């Protein structure tokens, strides 16, 4: 009872897992488990959720949420960026060009 | 046959073609009245600076990028900081009557070859001790050359035009065979046309009448130019720089007659006595810049140059700031780059004082019938010990909270009374009445330290304070450059936002207008901020006004109640992140369509709860004849408001594309 | 910049240059003539910027008329798949008249 | 939440469409009729009460906006009435 | 806004710019300047309309 | 256009601005007929936008007057943008 859970759009807000959905669509499970971390890390981002610490949204990584974390291939992408800085290094535009 | 012809006078068939005579046109005015925010669109808006103009052509192309959006801004705020920099010279009042009329302001860039700018105010507008914001008028570029001694330039209006009268000096080379050298005059006057440019400027010989004048050695010679009331002739004097208006009722007026065609005849003295004796008063002394009115047959209004750098305009009790020193301390702010130019404490950016005064903190008590009356209206007066009559300073309704406010206190120069040196008093529809004592007593020492005068009742203030180590006051989004200031921290993230929507850049949509507004949250420093809107002016309107601007115009009944702009903003958050979730959902792969999901899902919450309404109520089917009588007052009354059907249409939206999602159909719906 | 250009020669130029026993030598002029010089010049580059907004509004509306072509092949390809099927099955039939 | 932020600038809104909102068109109706009701003197022949009667003791209902009456009958209907009383 | 530009630098400039032991100075042709200024001006201003 | 390269850079209020020392000639007159110079500090600032503001002029003739220079010698130009009050420090 201390979640308000009255309808089946908030058992799907609170368990992550969508219980309405269809039996045609089919997703692995790890991807699901992503899914579900992600939803549940936006609603304590927006504070729908009654209170996310102040401390841990601090962090680097949800500041960097939106622009990189958020999806998983802007997160690989970025990763390889770092990692393999040939793939994404064009000759005919740089940063810092004079 | 014959229709009444009072009738037919109404408003509602003056509006009738236009508006009335279609259903369709009048259910849109009375939406676009009571619902601003759907016709809101920050790509063209009304009343629309220049500088914005040159900034959304700038911005409107196929390809936007970050480098070119910020290059964009950095243009746009070196023309905002350009026409943010200049000074005020010297100002005309329209009416004889300070009361009324209109008030041109001439200023100067701040560049060797001068840019000259009029601006225009509107004291009609002006009231309960505050100017209007859209009373003021944005700067305006002159496009003739000018080029004054000693910026002796004095607008004046003519014939109800816009006239520039500056004096010009030139140097040549007497022989004496010794060689030698000495200076010319040539008054110059100028028009502007229908269209906004500048006439050229039309030589006036005025050699013979300066050389009269035995001016100081580099002292410019007092010009005093006023239109006539009736006959159609500018009043030219030239008169000697003296430091008290005492000296210029027998100073020997010079001056000269400038007719409709600028033929031109000179003043007998006789005349020029007259004219003297008549609006001696207006004359700038060596310690004071003063503003002519037009002729006639209680001070003046008045422009200061503090030192600290502020400029203000005197009248009576009454000072209003001139320009601004915000974009003087902005440079720091764009050292380190837009995410600093748009933050918070950049909003919080201190102006100056003005004048000489103290700054007080009052404190308004509750609602308390017994105390307060039925009528909740209550205005602060100030009274000064000249004994004229009280001025108002603020007026408000009374809250059953408190009510913080902090005013400006002006004093004198010169402190005519020992005791105490303001009167502040508290006045509402229960006591109207003031009483001697009955409210704070202000008085100074020789340090310049305020205190409350123990002798003076404080019963119905709640709390009296005097800020002593406040000589500063935050950046004013109601002054003069409250146009501009609107201008850049708001409408133009909301401008680029929007562009940057179209070319379907949605990562940099999504920082441009979260820089407005962002539900996450601000993160400074390290530190997550308390504050949800970026906007000072969104932030501190937290609820509507008791009634709307009625207006059929979308944007001066937002900018009268800025609760709307937050709809928008609200609005334009909900269409970003749709947008997003159709462009993923376009990718009918699997791991694709659940981040449409998350993001259809993001926005759901975002909009809550959809409303429910119940479907019959107290409304009984009423004739239309008894409809009418209701209805006609001496349609609220009768009729009930509905919800937004825009907002309503994306609770529709929503629903339909995670039924969708649900089904593993398309957007289009097929399996 | 070619406005503060030409304002800061004109203000330059009002200073005399000839000295001694001739004097004087300022074009009186000079600030009416960077005013024209800069006014002329406000009408190019509205033109430039102009015709660069109208390449613009080109290359979209190029694009979407390959948004007409690509659904046209697409619907032709689409409808060929069918005419295959029926093909398919009026060979059936005359398999089994044989 | 839009509710949580933007509601209560009305105690009781209303359905896009019904017939209790002020911008239906019976809310038109009974505003254009209020001005509309005295562009003539009541003596003139041209009065609106005299020239539709019918039309002033019109019931506002969401039954009079739904159903999509043919025309021709209210004339009929109209004309025979007029008939039949005079 | 050029013609009433290059019109006042015309009527500004026939005005003598040296004094004293040496006069004039005045360039003579500088309405046909700008009369001709304004004119090819025309020009440019009807192509872009 | 500086005399003898007289340039010297300044930060003021997180700016950059130039000083520079202009110098020109003109001839007193003395009937025999004599020259002598003028100087010139003007003092520009570039804009947010890259562009450079237009350079004002100060005239300086009487303070470099003061300083007896040697014949074609450059003034010790100093330019320094103070803490906390802004104001420019600019000593010959």
Not at chain 2, 443 to 465: A, W
């Amino acid at each position: 009872a201390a979640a308000a859970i009255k309808s089946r759009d908030d058992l799907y807000q609170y368990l992550l897992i969508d219980n309405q959905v269809s039996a045609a669509i089919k997703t692995t499970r790890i991807a699901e488990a992503i899914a579900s971390i992600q939803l549940y890390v936006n609603r304590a981002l927006e504070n729908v959720e009654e209170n996310a610490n102040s401390g841990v949204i601090s962090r680097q990584f949800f500041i960097d949420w939106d622009k990189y974390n958020k999806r998983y291939s802007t997160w690989a992408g970025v990763s390889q960026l770092v990692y393999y800085p040939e793939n994404y290094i064009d000759p005919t535009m740089r940063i810092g060009q004079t | 046959e014959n229709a009444n012809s009072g009738v037919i006078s109404r408003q509602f068939f003056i509006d009738w073609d236009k508006y009335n005579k279609r259903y369709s046109t009048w259910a849109g005015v009375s939406q676009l009245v009571y619902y601003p925010e759907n016709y809101i669109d920050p790509t063209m808006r009304i009343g629309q600076t220049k500088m914005m103009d040159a900034l959304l052509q700038s911005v409107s192309q196929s390809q936007l990028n970050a480098d070119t959006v910020e290059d964009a801004f950095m243009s746009y705020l070196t023309s905002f900081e350009q026409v943010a920099n200049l000074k005020v010279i010297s100002a005309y009042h329209d009416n004889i009557n300070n009361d009324q009329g209109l008030t041109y302001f001439i200023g100067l860039s701040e560049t060797d070859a001068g840019e000259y700018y009029w601006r225009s105010v509107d004291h009609s507008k002006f009231n309960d001790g505050k100017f209007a914001a859209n009373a003021w008028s944005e700067w305006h570029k002159i496009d003739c050359p000018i080029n004054p001694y000693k910026s002796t330039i004095r607008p004046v209006i003519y014939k109800s035009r816009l006239y520039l009268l500056w004096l010009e000096q030139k140097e040549i080379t007497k022989q004496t065979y010794q060689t030698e050298t000495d200076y010319r005059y040539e008054l110059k006057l100028a028009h502007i046309r229908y269209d906004g440019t500048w006439n050229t400027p039309i030589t006036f010989d005025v050699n013979k009448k300066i050389s009269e004048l035995k001016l100081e050695k580099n002292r410019a010679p007092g010009l005093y130019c006023a239109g006539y009331q009736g006959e159609d002739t500018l009043l030219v004097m030239f008169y000697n720089q003296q430091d008290t208006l005492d000296s210029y009722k027998n100073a020997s007026m010079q001056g000269l007659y400038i007719f409709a065609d600028m033929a031109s005849k000179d003043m007998t003295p006789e005349q020029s006595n007259v004219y003297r004796d008549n609006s001696y008063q207006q004359f700038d002394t060596n310690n004071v810049r003063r503003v002519n009115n037009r002729y006639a047959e209680d001070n003046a209004l008045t422009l200061h140059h503090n030192e600290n750098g502020a400029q203000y305009m005197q009248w009576q009790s009454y000072r209003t700031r001139l320009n601004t020193l915000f974009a003087r301390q902005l440079v720091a702010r764009a050292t380190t780059g837009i995410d600093t130019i748009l933050s918070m404490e950049t909003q919080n950016i201190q102006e100056p004082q003005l004048g000489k005064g103290f700054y007080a903190t009052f404190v308004i008590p509750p609602y308390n019938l017994s105390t307060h009356g039925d009528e909740r209206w209550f205005k602060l007066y100030i009274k000064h010990v000249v004994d004229n009559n009280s001025h108002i300073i603020y007026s408000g309704q009374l809250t059953d909270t408190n009510i913080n406010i902090t005013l400006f206190i002006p004093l004198d120069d010169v402190p005519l009374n020992q005791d105490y040196h303001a009167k502040v008093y508290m006045t509402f529809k229960k006591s109207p009445s003031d009483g001697t004592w009955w409210g704070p007593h202000f008085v100074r020492d020789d340090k310049g330290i305020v205190t409350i005068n123990p002798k003076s009742i404080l019963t119905h203030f709640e709390s009296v304070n005097v800020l002593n180590n406040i000589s500063s006051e935050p950046m004013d989004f109601s002054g003069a450059n409250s146009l501009y200031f609107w201008e850049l921290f708001y409408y133009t993230p909301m401008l680029v936002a929007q562009r940057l929507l179209h070319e379907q850049n949605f990562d940099e949509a999504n920082r441009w207008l979260k820089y407005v507004w962002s539900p996450s949250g601000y993160i400074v420093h390290g530190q997550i901020q308390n504050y949800q809107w970026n906007v000072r002016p969104l932030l501190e309107d937290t609820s509507w006004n008791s009634d709307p601007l009625d207006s059929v115009d979308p944007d001066a009944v937002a900018q009268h109640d800025p609760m709307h702009y937050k709809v928008s903003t609200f609005m334009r958050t909900l269409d970003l992140l749709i947008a997003r979730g159709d462009h993923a959902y376009r990718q009918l792969e699997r791991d694709t369509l659940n981040e449409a999901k998350m993001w259809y899902m993001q926005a759901l919450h975002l909009l809550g709860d959809k409303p429910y309404l119940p479907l019959s109520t107290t409304w009984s089917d009423p004739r239309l004849d008894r409809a009418a009588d209701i209805t006609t007052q001496n349609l609220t009354d009768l009729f009930l408001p509905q919800i937004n059907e825009v907002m309503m249409n994306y609770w529709q939206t929503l629903a339909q594309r995670v039924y969708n999602l649900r089904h593993n159909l398309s957007i289009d719906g097929q399996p | 910049a070619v406005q503060a250009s030409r304002l800061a020669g004109a203000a330059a130029d009002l200073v005399p240059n000839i000295f001694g026993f001739a004097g004087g030598g300022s074009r009186w002029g000079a600030i009416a003539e960077a005013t024209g010089y800069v006014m002329e010049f406000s009408a190019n580059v509205m033109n430039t910027e102009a015709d660069k907004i109208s390449q613009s509004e080109t290359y979209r509306r190029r694009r979407q008329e390959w948004e007409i072509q690509r659904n046209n092949a697409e619907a032709e390809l689409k409808q060929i798949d069918a005419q295959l099927k029926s093909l398919a099955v009026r060979r059936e039939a005359a398999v089994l008249q044989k | 939440g839009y509710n949580n932020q933007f509601s209560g600038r009305a105690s009781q809104y209303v359905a896009p469409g019904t017939v209790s909102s002020m911008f239906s068109p019976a809310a038109y109706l009974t505003e254009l009729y209020r001005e509309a009701r005295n562009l003539h003197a009541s003596d003139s022949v041209y009065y609106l009460d005299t020239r539709r009667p019918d039309l002033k003791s019109m019931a506002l209902s969401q039954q009079n906006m739904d159903i999509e009456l043919s025309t021709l009958s209210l004339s009929n209907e109209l004309l025979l009435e007029s008939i039949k009383t005079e």
